[PDB]
Structures are given as C-alpha cells and as structure tokens.
RNA sequence: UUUUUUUUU
C-alpha cells in the first residue's frame, strides 16, 4: 500500500489493447462517422415583437390560450383544454411571472419547491416561452436520474402540450431514444447527458440546462456540475438551472459563485405523514403486515412501497399475493394486483404499474399495490397512488479505501429521501404516508442528506470520463466535492497501467475508444484487445453475462440439482468460459426447440439475466461495429481456443491476479498483497496456483470469485509494465517464484 | 450462500 515510484517498461508500447485501438482509430478515421442531422422547427411569426429574454408571463398565458399551438402547426385537443385547466391552478405556475423576472436576470438559478408541485413539468415549458430555441436553432435539456422518470414525464409533458411523443418533446434512455429531429424539449438521465458532454465538450447543442434532483449527488450529476462552471466561462449565452424538492441549497449557491435561490411555497394536496410509535424488529414484515392492513381497511386508491433488493422484492410480491388472495376469499377483501418494480425489468415490465386499479364484481374497493426499489423514489407521478409504505432501508454503495473496492450495503435512507418518498403522493388527489420508524428516528437516526456518489464510488471510471471531457489538471479541477487525493492518484496509476493515460497525462488511442463504451475500464480494455487474439465475439459474450447479475439460480432446500445443473455447463480452468458455455447453450436452437424459458427453468438458469446480457451483448456489438472492431474468432478444433480467450481475459484483468501459497492453504492477490480464498461457487475443483479473478467480495471471509487459470507467462507478455520484478515488495511468496518464471524465461532466450 | 441507480437504437 506505500507504493512508490518504481521505473517500469512503456504500458503504452507494450498493451496489446492499444495496438488493436489504434487500428480501431485509423479505421474510423477512414470512414469518419456520419455528422449529426440538424434540427427541424417551425419558421415561426407569431413569436415575434418582443425583444429577447424579456418575456412576461401574461404574454404565455395568451399564447396559451389559443386555438393554435406556438411551437406546431397543430390546432389543439379538447385534453389540452383539459389538461391546462388542470395545471394552471398548480402552486408552480401562481409564481411563474417571478420565475422569468429571476431567469431572465441570471445565469445560474437554484430553484426549491414542494414536492409534486409542477417543477419538472412547467418549468421547463416556462424556459421554453422565454427561451427561443426554434429561432435560434438549440435544445433544451432537462435531466433525470432515472430512466422511469424522465420517459414517464416525457410523455406526461408530451400530453400537455400537445404533441405526439418522440416528435417535439421526447426523452433519451441508453436502450432507446425517442429524440427526433423535431425535438426541442428533451428528457434524459444525466449519464446520456455526459456522454453528450463527453462527445461534445461545450454542449454547444444546448442554450439551457436544467438538472432536477440534484440532492442525489449522483456521479454525473456532479461531474456535469463541474464541467459546466467552466462551460459557463467559456460560454456566457447558457443558462443553467437547478431544481430539487429538498435541498441544502447553501452549498449550491456558494458554489455557483452567490447563485441566485427561489424558494415557492404552496401546496398542491396534503400529505399526512404516520409514525410507528416504537421500533419496527422486522422491516419486511412490517411493510407486508402495513400494506395488507390498508389494503384490508383504509380508503380507496393504490399502495406504494419502497424495499431494497429485486430479491426482496419478488419474495414480498409473492407473499402478498398469497395472503391477498386468502384475504379475499376468506375475510371478502376487494382484488388485490400486485407489481414488481426494479432496475434490471424491462421498460415494458416497469410501466406495468400505470395499469388500473383491479375491477369489483364484490362491491369491495379492489387495489394495486406498486412494489419498488428507489428507482421510483424520486420525480415520479404515478396516478393511482394514494398510500405510500416506507420503511426507510435502501441499499447504498460503501468502499473500503484499504482495499480499494466497492460494494452494496443495506443502509438507512435520508431525510431528503424521505421527504422524497413521501412526497411521492398527495398529487391527483390527498395522499397518506406510513413510515416503519419513529418521528425521533427522522429527527435524528436519518442522515440529513445522503453521501456524494464521488465520495464514495471508485474513480477508475471516473477518471476516464473526466478525461474525455478534456480537464487535463484533475487535482486542480473544480468539484463541489474534491474526493480523495489518495483514491485519485491510485485510479490514474490503475489506468496508466492499462494504458489508457500516457506517462505524459493525456488519453491515449486506447482510452479514446473505452471510454465510450458503457463499461468498467478493465472490461473496457478487455474488450478492445479481444480481436487481436482472434476472439472477440467469445470476449463480447463474456463481457456481456458479467455486466449482468448472477445467472445460476440455487434453491435453499434443493442444492443438489441446481449444483449437478451448473455442472452440466461446468468447464476446467475457467469461471468465465463457463459463462460462455451457458449463454452459447442459451442462443443454440435446441434450446430455442426445447422452450427457452422453460429450458431455463429446466437448467436452473435466470432467464432475466440471459435475456438482459443477449441485450447488453447486441448494444455492445453495435458499438463494436460503430467504433470499427472486428469481430473474430477460432474454431474449438482448435486448441488455441481457450488459450486465446485466457490471453484476451488477462489483456484486461492483468491487475487482478491470485497465487496459491507455494505448500500451504489459501491464495495471495498480486496487487496490494492480500491473503484470499476461492468462492465456494468457482467451478475450478483443482488447484490451479496461476488465476485471473473477476469479484473481490467480503463477507465471512476475503474470498474471491468468478476465476480461471493463467499462464504467468501470458502475464508477463501481455503486461510488462506491471510485471517487471521491480515494481513489487522484497521477497515474498508471488515474487519468489515468479522469479522463476523469469529465470525460466531468460533461459529459454539463451538458449536460442 | 449477498446487482440500489446510471452510462447513443
Ligand atoms: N398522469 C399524470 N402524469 C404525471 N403527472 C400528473 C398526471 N396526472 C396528474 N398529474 C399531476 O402533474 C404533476 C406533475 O408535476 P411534477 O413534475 O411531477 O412535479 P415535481 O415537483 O417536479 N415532482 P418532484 O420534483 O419529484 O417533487 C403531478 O404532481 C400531478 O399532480
Ligand atoms: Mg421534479
């Protein structure tokens, strides 16, 4: 851990990866990707006899009231009618006038209101009749952090002014993007916004920027931050916009250089929020017993709770319906319908819970209970619900500086996030709120805010990212949080080993092209260097079913068959070619002749997680063929096969590397010297002293997963830079036989 | 035996 210095080979010559990125970069610059397509927009004229920036709010509401709409030729519907009725009495809109006056006056505005008072949705539209981006040929971009959220109100605003969604107003997800040509009001994550940053460095397409949510501090939320201070200086004809429900806007305002706040009141339709008067002993069964008793006797309208894991979550989904169900038929309860509500669904499976309430053949109320993670935790406005349970857990991300890794804890919530959940109701009509923990609890045990993404997240990636921006002095660069000068060296050391930062500082070849994909760097570089081994399709797969959870289902009571299925696609030497054996079985006919789900649930397989990573696996293709990566690979007669794969694996996961201690128990990590064992669900049965792992994972004891076996030779060859004898402590159990390894090489060259 | 969220079809 007291690295120091240490005179190492040229990563950069040597990387194999950065050999196979310069191809990639000279085959894009033979064939330079198509330019972007400007934007259509009406000519306008009605728009015109004001000067610029000096809108007023009389003005919008007689543009408004028209029979015609500003922005399209289209003459409005009566639901327009309908709809503007309805938000012109929200609290938002009564301070609209103010809004403009501050708006027009200032370059960086912090805005604070309560929650489901009309930020994300009139907001906007109120830059929009300020702003002229038809005229002067720009977008406007408000931001997300959830996929759910920014499509939901996409189309909520796409209903609200009355155009068909995808044509000018529109949202921007990684796995699909209903952002034409016509777009001017666009919805996105702010990761889909980064990587617009990343592409283009000034965001010249944008005159206004608006993040909303911004109390997540989520990693690209403060990157974006970060860059667009200094885009603000470079460029004075953008405006920037922060919303939040909650905020400590204090930090905001200093750091914007005394940026401006306005604070509305008003609220839309009260809230009432429940305390449990003592401690709930288990949250979960608390949240079921909860939801079953409003179901059983409180009023009309529909159930949302939050919980923490996918896992959790079908478990909860299942018992409630079982007991629902016995509520129905033996106590005559009204239907109850359940959905399941996480990250790793479907678009389509995740707008599932805007279906209606259940139908009444009985006369009793029939409900629907919506059971989510906090991906519906913030800037979401679901119709039905009335009721919101929460019993105030979330899984958060906790790294450990000592062992430079991330992972997931169940943590407690946030007041922010509280307020957050609970403002989730009270929008359509009145809502109730019951929280599993006492009101001292929220006063005191809840944090005020939730901890930084950067604070906490590995910067490997981050890094990369900033990079691609174009910020040469990371250290000196202007976050609203510096993280850790010790996190920020060694994660510039990490990719100065891979080769994607030159001993200079600057991107190489290699880190230009990884950073566009949506991968962890080391995956990333894995990837790049795939087809230089001739098998950069296997590599795709590979990386594909690890960007995906676990695919192999266990039973607590029936270990034994989901063991002897695992086994059947078991292969020697590898916990990665095994991967790659499920999913060529997955793809293969048979299983396609057989009943692919049901040959999933006939091999003890998750068909979520093969449908997601055959998913991942096509997008990344289709970013392999764009960046111009050739697809390659070798036939199994071959027995390079699994050597080649091997090879390409340590291309990118050199750093990662286990030895078994030479006559004794337990293995020894290369990197930062660490005693290790194998996880109990490695397929390798033998004791193999060279692996390659993937997981570093600690629970009852530092264990290792997902590994296979590597020559020390393919190491050094493929990563000198970090395998020079120079670079690693006096002798220890790895440097003394990889010494002889060295010996052995040395001698092998003698001899020739 | 332990993937919340996000990252150009
Ligand atoms: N079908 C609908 N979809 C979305 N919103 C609806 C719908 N029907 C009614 N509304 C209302 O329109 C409002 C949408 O405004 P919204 O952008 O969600 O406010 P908000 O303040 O940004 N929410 P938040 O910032 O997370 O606290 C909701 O609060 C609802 O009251
Ligand atoms: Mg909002």
């Given at each position: 851990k007291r690295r120091f210095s240490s005179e190492h080979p040229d990563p950069v010559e040597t990387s194999i990866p950065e050999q196979a990125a310069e191809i990639a970069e000279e085959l894009s610059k033979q064939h330079p990707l198509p330019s972007e397509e400007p934007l259509v927009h009406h000519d306008a004229?009605?728009?015109?006899?004001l000067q610029r920036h000096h809108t007023s709010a009389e003005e919008a509401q007689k543009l408004e009231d028209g029979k015609i709409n500003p922005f399209t030729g289209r003459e409005f519907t009566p639901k327009y009618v309908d709809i503007l009725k309805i938000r012109r009495?929200?609290?938002v809109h009564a301070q609209r006038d103010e809004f403009l006056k501050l708006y027009q006056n200032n370059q960086i505005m912090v805005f604070v209101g309560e929650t489901g008072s009309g930020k994300t949705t009139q907001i906007p539209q109120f830059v929009l009749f300020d702003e002229m981006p038809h005229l002067e040929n720009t977008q406007v971009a408000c931001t997300q952090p959830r996929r759910v959220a920014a499509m939901s109100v996409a189309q909520r605003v796409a209903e609200e002014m009355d155009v068909k969604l995808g044509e000018e107003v529109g949202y921007s997800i990684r796995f699909e993007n209903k952002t034409?040509?016509?777009?001017i009001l666009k919805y996105m994550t702010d990761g889909m916004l980064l990587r617009e940053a990343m592409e283009?460095?000034?965001?010249?397409?944008?005159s206004c920027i608006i993040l909303d949510?911004?109390?997540?501090?989520?990693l690209a939320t403060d990157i974006l931050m970060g860059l667009l201070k200094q885009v603000v200086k470079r460029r004075p004809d953008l405006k920037i916009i922060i919303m939040s429900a909650?905020?400590?806007?204090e930090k905001f305002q200093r750091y914007f250089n005394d940026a401006p706040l306005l604070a509305v009141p008003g609220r839309t339709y009260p809230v009432e929020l429940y305390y449990t008067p003592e401690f709930q002993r288990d949250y979960l069964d608390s949240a079921i017993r909860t939801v079953l008793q409003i179901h059983a006797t409180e009023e009309a309208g529909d159930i949302l709770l939050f919980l923490t894991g996918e896992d959790e979550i079908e478990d909860a989904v299942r018992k409630i319906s079982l007991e629902g169900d016995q509520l129905v038929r033996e106590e005559g309860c009204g239907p109850l319908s359940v959905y399941p509500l996480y990250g790793s669904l479907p678009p389509h499976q995740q707008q599932r819970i805007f279906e209606p309430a259940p139908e009444s053949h009985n006369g009793r109320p029939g409900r629907k209970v919506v059971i989510s993670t906090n991906?519906?935790?913030?800037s979401l406005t679901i119709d039905g619900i009335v009721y919101v349970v929460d019993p105030g857990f979330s899984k958060q991300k906790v790294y450990n500086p000592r062992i430079r890794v991330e992972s997931l804890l169940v943590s407690p919530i946030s007041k922010a996030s509280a307020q957050q959940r609970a403002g989730?109701?009270?929008?359509?009509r009145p809502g109730k709120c019951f929280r599993l923990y006492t009101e001292e609890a929220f006063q005191k045990?809840?944090?005020e805010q939730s901890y930084p993404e950067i604070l906490r997240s590995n910067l490997s990636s981050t890094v990369l990212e900033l990079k691609k921006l174009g910020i040469d002095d990371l250290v000196h660069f202007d976050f609203m949080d510096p993280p850790a000068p010790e996190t920020m060296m060694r994660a510039l050391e990490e990719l100065n080993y891979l080769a994607c930062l030159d001993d200079e500082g600057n991107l190489t070849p290699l880190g230009r092209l990884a950073?566009?994909?949506?991968?962890d760097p080391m995956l990333a570089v894995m990837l790049i260097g795939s087809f230089e081994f001739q098998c950069s399709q296997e590599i795709l797969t590979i990386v594909a079913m690890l960007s995906v959870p676990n695919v192999f289902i266990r039973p607590t009571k029936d270990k034994k068959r989901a063991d002897d299925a695992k086994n059947i696609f078991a292969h020697p030497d590898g916990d990665h070619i095994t991967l790659l054996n499920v999913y060529h079985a997955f793809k293969s006919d048979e299983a396609y002749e057989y009943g692919i789900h049901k040959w999933c649930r006939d091999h003890y397989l998750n068909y979520r997680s093969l449908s997601a990573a055959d998913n991942i696996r096509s997008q990344l293709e289709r970013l392999m063929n764009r960046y111009n990566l050739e697809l390659n690979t070798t036939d199994y007669?071959?027995?390079k096969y699994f050597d080649n794969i091997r090879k390409a694996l340590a291309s990118g996961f050199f750093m990662q590397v286990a030895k078994k201690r030479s006559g004794a128990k337990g293995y020894i990590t290369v990197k930062d010297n660490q005693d290790v064992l194998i996880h109990?669900?490695?397929?390798?049965?033998?004791?193999?002293?060279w692996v390659i792992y993937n997981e570093f994972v600690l629970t009852s004891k530092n264990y290792i997963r997902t590994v296979t076996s590597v020559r020390p030779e393919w190491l050094i060859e493929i990563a000198p830079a970090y395998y020079d004898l120079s670079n690693f402590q006096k002798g220890d159990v790895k440097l003394s036989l990889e010494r002889i390894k060295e010996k052995v090489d040395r001698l092998n060259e003698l001899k020739q």
């Open positions: 004229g009605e728009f015109k006899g009495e929200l609290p034409s040509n016509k777009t283009d460095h000034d965001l010249s397409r944008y949510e911004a109390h997540e501090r989520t909650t905020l400590d806007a991906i519906a935790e913030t989730r109701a009270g929008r359509t045990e809840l944090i950073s566009q994909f949506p991968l007669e071959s027995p109990p669900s490695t397929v390798l049965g033998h004791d193999a002293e």
